[PDB]
């Protein structure tokens with residue numbers, strides 16, 4: 001478990017600092033984005049994961065991964081694949097998948 005929870009910190013810090021992470025650093029502010037409140041049932045972003053991971057609220061490495069994939073599904077649900085946010089999210093999702101397999 002400790003080996004697992006350590007890899008998540010390596011992964012999230014690399015995601016937090018990735019060039020394409022700029023759409024995921026703080027929660028989407030629905031005041032600024034038409035339709036986001038209606039379309040996305042369960043928001044998630046890197047800061048929410050970082051709080052939860054610090055406070056220690058990830059039982060398993062698979063709970064963490066679930067939160068990561070929820071970020072990118074929300075992104076694909078709300079943003080077109082050729083939008084600025086969309087393009088960035090594909091890079092981040094492919095980065096997460098590629099590096100997550102580098103341990104599991």
Ligand SMILES: Cn1cc(CCn2cnc(-c3cnn(C)c3)c2-c2ccc(C#N)cc2)cn1
Pocket residue numbers: 022023024025026027028029030032033075078079085
């Ligand atoms: C925090 N805020 C900023 C905005 C306006 C810009 N904007 C429009 N669309 C998105 C968006 C939609 N989906 N995703 C994953 C991001 C954003 C945006 C840009 C950067 C961040 C950060 N960090 C968060 C959101 C709205 N909220």
